[PDB]
């Protein structure tokens, strides 16, 4: 009789207390002797006493049901992803058997109840995705068995409390995405000897990283990113025996990357990007088999250590926006499944490493604003994995490998401001995903291949400052997704055709400084989105078409051609004075033309 | 950067059925490789080209942060709501083309601060209220179309507006003055 309970009645009171529009609690029937087969209800004894209630994602709305604490054997409660609102009550401590409490992704507001620390059995507390505000209660320092504390994405506006360092059982401290009063990392956090995760992203952290943090031998993840931390990366961090991931990105950190980081055998991910770090990337760190190394947007200098090529698990290296000098590792990509390489805005020189895509997983090759020299490795012609190629603002030369033109998943190919020679291969027809082709300021020669018109989804063709020649392929006029066509500073010849009408999405047409001949097609007026037209420095002949006045153009240059006849009254104005200069047969009502 | 963030803010408030803004990746260092965005040699945005893209939704004040923008092309779309006053903070703007949209509300007085503006086309919208006298202080203005709107009041005829013909102000609700038929009370 002492082992009798009213658990079904108590659960019915919970049901009555909460709005259930979608009828998730339909299976809760007051006629049932026991609630043990009800949805979200578990009686793990078989003695008919409720041990677990999981009401996750049930669209339940209302305040926290304090009556549930009258379930004497309740050890697990999840109200995750519901509309639970109002303040979390201080009488939650009545739930004295609770080991796990998940009230995450709710509308709970107000100050955290200090009585949460008065549940001795509590091991897991998750209040993520709530509107909790004010100071973390001092009671939280006195948690008896808590291993997990998560207050992520709340409105907590207090300082980060040192007393949280006094929870000896703590494995995870998750305080990320909180509008905390700007505060330092307490040195007492180094007393959390069993801590595996320290997640303090966007916690308005100020001051220096305490040396004490080096004593956290069991730490797997250290995330101090998106804060205003100042000072050096502590050499004490070499003490983090089990650390796998370290995130210090977007702080105000200064000083050199400690060589002691090489002592971290388990380190796989390091991001110290968007800081003010000085000096050279240490060889000892590069010896560690890293999976991701991001040190971009720092003031780092010197050579990239060749040891980084040794890692068999490297997929991400982003070290752009530094003053790094010398050449890339020769064996980079040979032994690693490299996916993302960004060495842009550096002083790197020498040939590109030959086997960057050896493992066949390279998606992004970004090397812009460097002094890289020589030819594109022929191996990259078989790198079908590539999606983004940016080799611009380098000292490259020679013919592009034939295959490189026809890589199937490449969205952007950018070879601008190099000395690349040769022709675009007919292989360009294979570039199914190509949207942006930028080949400007090179030494490219030859006719544009007819297969360029096979690229139905091509949005931008920019081939300025080249030695391209010949009549435009008839296929080029079939590109109806083309927004920008810039062929200025070339030796293109022949006539434009009626097919230009199919350029319905063309915003900019620039054919300036070429050898184009014939009349401007009357179909120029059919181009609805054309606002920029430059046909200057050609041998275009005949009368300017009347259809041109239909267009709303912000830029027009027809200067230095052989155009004849009269400037229509619409185009005879002071805003078009520099648009029709250098056409001897042309005369209009402009003061200087004739 | 800031310019990329501002353009991304516009993307989230615009409705984009044909995914024309698919390339607008905020993780990029700058938006210069974004399709429909043209940058200068210093990698600052000088053109946004989003005409006839079936875009709906509203504009954002964040467009004002594009200090070097010269051409804003948002014409032939279904953009609704007010023309942002912060467009007046676009100091280097040469073309403002918001024509063939469902823009409501007043023509902002701030647009007068666009000293270098040469093209203003707000035609085929539902804009209401008076034409600001600030617009006459734009010495560079060479093209103006406020036609097919619901504007009212006196049409300015001084400064830049001296050369402007009736086709610029046609089919408005109750515009008065010399360029129009009805003179002003």
């Amino acid at each position: 009789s002492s082992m009798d309970n009213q658990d079904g009645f108590i659960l019915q009171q919970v049901k009555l207390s909460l709005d259930d529009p979608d009828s998730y609690l339909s299976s809760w029937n007051s006629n049932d002797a026991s609630p043990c087969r009800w949805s979200g209800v578990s009686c793990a004894g078989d003695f008919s006493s409720v041990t677990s209630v999981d009401l996750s994602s049930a669209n339940l709305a209302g305040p926290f049901p304090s009556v549930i604490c009258r379930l004497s054997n309740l050890a697990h409660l999840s109200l995750y992803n519901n509309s639970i609102n109002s303040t979390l009550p201080l009488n939650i401590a009545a739930c004295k058997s609770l080991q796990t409490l998940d009230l995450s992704q709710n509308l709970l507001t107000g100050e955290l109840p200090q009585t949460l620390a008065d549940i001795p059995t509590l091991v897991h507390l998750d209040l993520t995705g709530n509107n909790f505000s004010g100071d973390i209660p001092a009671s939280f320092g006195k948690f008896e068995n808590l291993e997990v504390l998560s207050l992520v994405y709340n409105l907590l506006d207090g300082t980060i409390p040192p007393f949280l360092g006094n929870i000896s059982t703590l494995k995870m401290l998750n305080l990320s995405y909180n509008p905390f009063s700007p505060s330092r990392i307490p040195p007492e956090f180094g007393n959390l000897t069993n801590l595996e995760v320290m997640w303090l992203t966007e916690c308005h952290l100020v001051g220096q990283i305490p040396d004490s943090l080096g004593q956290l031998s069991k730490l797997v993840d250290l995330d101090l990113a998106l804060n205003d931390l100042v000072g050096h990366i502590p050499p004490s961090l070499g003490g983090l025996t089990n650390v796998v991931q370290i995130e210090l990105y977007n702080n105000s950190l200064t000083g050199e990357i400690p060589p002691e980081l090489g002592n971290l055998k388990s380190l796989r991910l390091l991001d110290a990007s968007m800081n003010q770090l000085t000096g050279k990337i240490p060889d000892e760190l590069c010896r560690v088999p890293l999976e991701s190394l991001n040190l971009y947007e720092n003031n780092l200098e010197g050579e990239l250590p060749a040891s980084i090529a040794l890692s068999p698990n490297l997929y991400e290296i982003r070290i752009f926006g530094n003053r790094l000098t010398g050449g890339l590792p020769k064996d980079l990509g040979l032994n690693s499944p490299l996916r993302w390489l960004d060495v842009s805005e550096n002083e790197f020189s020498g040939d590109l490493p030959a086997d960057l895509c050896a493992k066949g997983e390279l998606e992004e090759l970004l090397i812009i604003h460097n002094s890289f020299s020589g030819v594109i490795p022929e191996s990259l012609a078989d790198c079908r994995s590539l999606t983004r190629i940016r080799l611009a603002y380098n000292r490259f030369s020679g013919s592009v490998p034939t295959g490189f033109w026809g890589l199937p998943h490449v969205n952007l190919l950018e070879l601008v401001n190099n000395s690349f020679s040769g022709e675009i291969s007919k292989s360009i027809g294979g570039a199914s995903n190509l949207s942006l082709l930028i080949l400007s300021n090179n030494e490219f020669t030859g006719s544009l291949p007819e297969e360029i018109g096979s690229l139905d989804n091509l949005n931008q063709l920019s081939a300025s400052g080249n030695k391209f020649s010949g009549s435009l392929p008839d296929s080029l006029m079939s590109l109806g997704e083309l927004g920008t066509l810039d062929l200025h500073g070339n030796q293109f010849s022949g006539e434009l055709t009626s097919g230009i009408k199919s350029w319905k999405k063309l915003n900019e047409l620039n054919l300036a400084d070429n050898e184009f001949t014939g009349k401007i097609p009357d179909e120029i007026g059919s181009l609805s989105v054309l606002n920029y037209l430059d046909l200057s420095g050609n041998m275009f002949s005949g009368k300017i078409p009347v259809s041109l006045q239909s267009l709303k153009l912000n830029q027009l240059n027809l200067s230095y051609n052989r155009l004849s006849g009269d400037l229509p009254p619409s185009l005879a104005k002071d805003m078009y004075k520099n648009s029709f200069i250098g056409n001897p047969g042309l005369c209009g009502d402009i003061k200087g033309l004739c | 950067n800031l310019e990329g963030d501002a353009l991304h803010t516009l993307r989230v408030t615009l409705v984009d059925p044909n995914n024309v803004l698919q390339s607008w990746d905020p993780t990029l260092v700058n938006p210069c490789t974004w399709f429909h965005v043209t940058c200068n040699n210093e990698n600052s945005v000088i053109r946004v080209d989003l005409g006839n893209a079936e875009l709906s939704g509203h504009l954002v004040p964040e467009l004002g942060v594009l200090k070097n923008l010269q051409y804003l092309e948002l014409y032939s779309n279904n953009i609704t709501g007010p023309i942002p006053s912060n467009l007046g903070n676009l100091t280097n703007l040469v073309s403002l083309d918001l024509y063939l949209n469902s823009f409501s509300g007043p023509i902002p007085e701030s647009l007068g601060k666009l000293s270098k503006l040469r093209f203003l086309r707000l035609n085929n919208n539902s804009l209401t209220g008076s034409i600001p006298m600030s617009l006459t202080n734009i010495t560079t203005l060479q093209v103006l179309d406020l036609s097919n709107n619901r504007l009212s009041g006196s049409v300015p005829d001084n400064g830049s507006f001296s050369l402007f013909t009736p086709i610029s102000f046609a089919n408005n609700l109750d515009l008065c003055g010399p360029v129009t038929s009805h003179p002003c009370p």
């Binding site: 995405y177 995130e247 970004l366 812009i368 | 993780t27």
Partner: peptide, 14 residues
């Protein structure tokens, strides 16, 4: 439901 940025490397690239 507010989605939560995971603890992971930053994603900025050219």
């Amino acid at each position: 439901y507010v989605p939560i940025p995971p603890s992971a490397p930053s994603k900025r690239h050219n």
